[PDB]
Design an enzyme around this catalytic site. Structure first.
Site, PDB file in Angstrom:
ATOM      1  N   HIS A   1       0.175   4.521   0.108  1.00  0.00           N
ATOM      2  CA  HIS A   1      -0.117   5.497   1.152  1.00  0.00           C
ATOM      3  C   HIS A   1      -0.253   4.837   2.520  1.00  0.00           C
ATOM      4  O   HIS A   1      -1.367   4.564   2.970  1.00  0.00           O
ATOM      5  CB  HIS A   1      -1.409   6.252   0.814  1.00  0.00           C
ATOM      6  CG  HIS A   1      -1.598   7.524   1.587  1.00  0.00           C
ATOM      7  ND1 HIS A   1      -2.199   8.637   1.044  1.00  0.00           N
ATOM      8  CD2 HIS A   1      -1.265   7.860   2.857  1.00  0.00           C
ATOM      9  CE1 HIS A   1      -2.232   9.605   1.943  1.00  0.00           C
ATOM     10  NE2 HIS A   1      -1.670   9.159   3.052  1.00  0.00           N
TER      11      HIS A   1
ATOM     12  N   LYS B   1       0.811  -1.209   0.000  1.00  0.00           N
ATOM     13  CA  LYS B   1       0.000   0.000   0.000  1.00  0.00           C
ATOM     14  C   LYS B   1       0.849   1.266   0.000  1.00  0.00           C
ATOM     15  O   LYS B   1       1.480   1.619   1.002  1.00  0.00           O
ATOM     16  CB  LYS B   1      -0.963   0.001   1.184  1.00  0.00           C
ATOM     17  CG  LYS B   1      -1.947   1.155   1.158  1.00  0.00           C
ATOM     18  CD  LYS B   1      -3.009   1.005   2.231  1.00  0.00           C
ATOM     19  CE  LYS B   1      -4.005   2.146   2.171  1.00  0.00           C
ATOM     20  NZ  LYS B   1      -4.570   2.302   0.801  1.00  0.00           N
TER      21      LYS B   1
END
Lengths: 206, 213
Positions: free
Chosen positions: B105, B103
Site C-alpha cells: 500500500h 510496501k
C-alpha cells in the site's frame, strides 16, 4: 496544553510533518491538515521525537514493563523512546519489535507491553501486533501515538476508540485535534485554517 | 586502546554481551569467547550503545552523509547512533533503512527514512561473512548512492573460509573502510589488565594463533 505538547506542534510544523492546507486523505476525505511523522528523518528529529514520546508516556502514569515497536514504523520510534527514557527519565526499559516474516527482536516479550507507534489509522497494525503480544502470554498496557485525529472511522466511533474498546487499554497521544485547534486559536494569521479545521471537525469529528 | 573502547568492553561484559568461556561458533570452531549484541536489549543499553558507535564514527574522521541501518538488526543501531550524534556531537544526520519487501500500500518502495543519497555509512552489529553486506550494497548501488564505510561493534580479526577475514573481503570487494569499536586485539590487551582473566587470556591468545587475522 502542556509545554511539551506545544513544542511538539511547533517542531512538527518546522519539519513539515504537520501541514495546514487542503489534502485528500486515503478515504476520500478532504482534510484541512496533514500529519506525516515519516518526515522526522534525521538524528535530531529522532532525538526530539523520542523526548516527546517519553514525556507523554511518563506524564500518563501508565504502568508498563516493556516498549514494543511494530515493524516497520514502530522500530525507530520504540528505539528512540527507549533511549529517551533512559537518558532523560532514568528508566531503563526493555524494548522489543517483531520481524514481518522466532519473529521477535529485543527482550523477551513478557509483562505489560506499551505499544509505540506513529498514528492509528484503521487499527490494523495494532490488531496484528496484538496477536503477537497475546501469543506470548504478554498483556497490552496501552498504545502510545503522536496524534489522535479524533475523527470518526467507517462507523460511529474513531479508530482510537475501537482499539480502546476491543482491548480495554488506554491509547496515549502526544497531541489531539483539540490541541491543534487551541494552538491555531492563538495565531491570528491562521484564521483561515482555524475555520477550515473547525468546519472539518463538525463533519467528521470525535 | 582508547578509554571509550575499554569502556565498551566493560559495558559488554556487564550485559553478558561479551562472554569468556568455550563456545561452539556458528562456523563450527570452538571459541574462547562469545559476542552477541542482541543482548543490548534495554533503553539504557541502546543509549550507551549509540554513544559508543557515535564515538567510533566521529573518531574515525570518515566522511558520510547518511546512516543506513540494514533490516532488522541495523535499524535500532542506526537509530540510536543517529540520536547519539545529534545529542552528544551536534551532528544532525539523515538516517535510512530498508524493508525486506516492498510496501504493498504505497509508493515508498523498500526504503524508510531520508532519500538514499550521497556517501552512506552502513551501521551494523558484526560482519560474520563477506556475503552479509550484499543485500545492503545492492540497495545502496541501486540508488546511485556510494558506500563511505561500514561501522560495527567487534572485528573478530580471524579468517573465514579463506585466508582473509570477512571484514577484509568487504573492504576489498567494496573498496571501503570497516570501522569497529573494538577488535580481537583489544580484548587481548584488556585481558592482560585483569589477573583473574589469565586463563581467558591464554585461551584467546591461542585461538588467535590458530585462526587469527
Amino acid at each position: 496544553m502542556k509545554p511539551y505538547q506545544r513544542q511538539f506542534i511547533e517542531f512538527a510544523l518546522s519539519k513539515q510533518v504537520l501541514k495546514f492546507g487542503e489534502f485528500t486523505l486515503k478515504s476520500g476525505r478532504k482534510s484541512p491538515y496533514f500529519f506525516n511523522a515519516g518526515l522526522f528523518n534525521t538524528g535530531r528529529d529522532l532525538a526530539l521525537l523520542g523526548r516527546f514520546y517519553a514525556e507523554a508516556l511518563v506524564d500518563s502514569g501508565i504502568e508498563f514493563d516493556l516498549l514494543f515497536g511494530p515493524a516497520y514504523k514502530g522500530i525507530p520510534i520504540a528505539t528512540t523512546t527507549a533511549v529517551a527514557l533512559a537518558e532523560h527519565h532514568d528508566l531503563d526499559l526493555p524494548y522489543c519489535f517483531n520481524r514481518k516474516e522466532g519473529n521477535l527482536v529485543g527482550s523477551a516479550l513478557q509483562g505489560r507491553v506499551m505499544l509505540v507507534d506513529d498514528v492509528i489509522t484503521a487499527g490494523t497494525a495494532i490488531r496484528e501486533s496484538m496477536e503477537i503480544i497475546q501469543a506470548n502470554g504478554a498483556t497490552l498496557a496501552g498504545v502510545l501515538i503522536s496524534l489522535d485525529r479524533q475523527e470518526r472511522g467507517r462507523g460511529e466511533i474513531s479508530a482510537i476508540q475501537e482499539v480502546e474498546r476491543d482491548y480495554n487499554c488506554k491509547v496515549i497521544s502526544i497531541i489531539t485535534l483539540k490541541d491543534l485547534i487551541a494552538y491555531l486559536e492563538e495565531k491570528p494569521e491562521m484564521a483561515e485554517h482555524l475555520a477550515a479545521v473547525k468546519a472539518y471537525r463538525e463533519e467528521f469529528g470525535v
